[PDB]
Amino acid sequence: LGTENLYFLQPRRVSFRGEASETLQSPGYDPSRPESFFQQSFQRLSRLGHGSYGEVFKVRSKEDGRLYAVKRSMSPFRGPKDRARKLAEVGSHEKVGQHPCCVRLEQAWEEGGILYLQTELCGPSLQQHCEAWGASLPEAQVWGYLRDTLLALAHLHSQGLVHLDVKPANIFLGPRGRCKLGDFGLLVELGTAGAGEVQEGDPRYMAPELLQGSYGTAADVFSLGLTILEVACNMELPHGGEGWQQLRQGYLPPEFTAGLSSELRSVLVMMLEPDPKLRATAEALLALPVLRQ
Ligand SMILES: C=CCn1c(=O)c2cnc(Nc3ccc(N4CCN(C)CC4)cc3)nc2n1-c1cccc(C(C)(C)O)n1
What we know:
monomer, 9 helices, binds ligand 8X7, alpha+beta, 10 strands, kinase domain, transferase/transferase inhibitor, six-stranded antiparallel beta sheet
């Protein structure tokens, strides 16, 4: 909080469910050496992605020799609110817990005002995959991605959690056609911190009701609806303007969606229902014969 007297450091494990072992240890790591825990405890193999948040690296852990993704924040915390905001991702990630369609958090720690998030290394995001594909993804695969991500959303929504930033860039491929939802930085728990507390996801995938500060689990279904549209049709979604409004008026452009099967188009229509009270739930979608087993 910005009105409290906590205004104005070596590694410390971040957890909202752990033990007195806030101290980290690892092969390769000596606290008395000047290098950070991240530098000492991991082989840095490549940079998976980057942005205003910082960077994500593919790493090999010196602890177990396994591969992971580590997201490192851009610079030291601006202050307590900045810190609480970034640390909330860890808490979010933990409330999800272990679900086969959600990216697992291995561990998290802060050092020198920098936050590090270590997660299981999955395959490329759907966005990266579509870019490498250079075209529409086959529907056979898309049905699989839709179902997995619906299972993740069903999980989140059961606990009154809303992701609020579902998009191709944070659904990651698994082996043999599976995929996992990740990037839980914007996730909110409904009815917790009621005075707050949303920031807004990517405008391309934003549910229309959010413009009016009205949010609920339904917003995630709409976001996924547009996610699947983009990857299934190889369609660039608008950030705004006439096209943005049209996609939130139940309109599906023929010049990109003519190649959809009737069954998939039918499912997208339910997900892109402008009125969140009529929009299908993830549980209801999963109950349809076309999305079971
Ligand atoms: C907390 C970190 C978020 N995050 C994960 O949790 C995570 C897990 N697995 C992966 N895997 C992954 C594997 C390969 C690739 N690429 C292959 C190499 N290309 C040049 C780029 C694409 C790419 C990824 N990637 C993962 N993450 C990741 C990696 C890059 C970018 C982003 C965001 C969502 C922040 O944009 N997230």
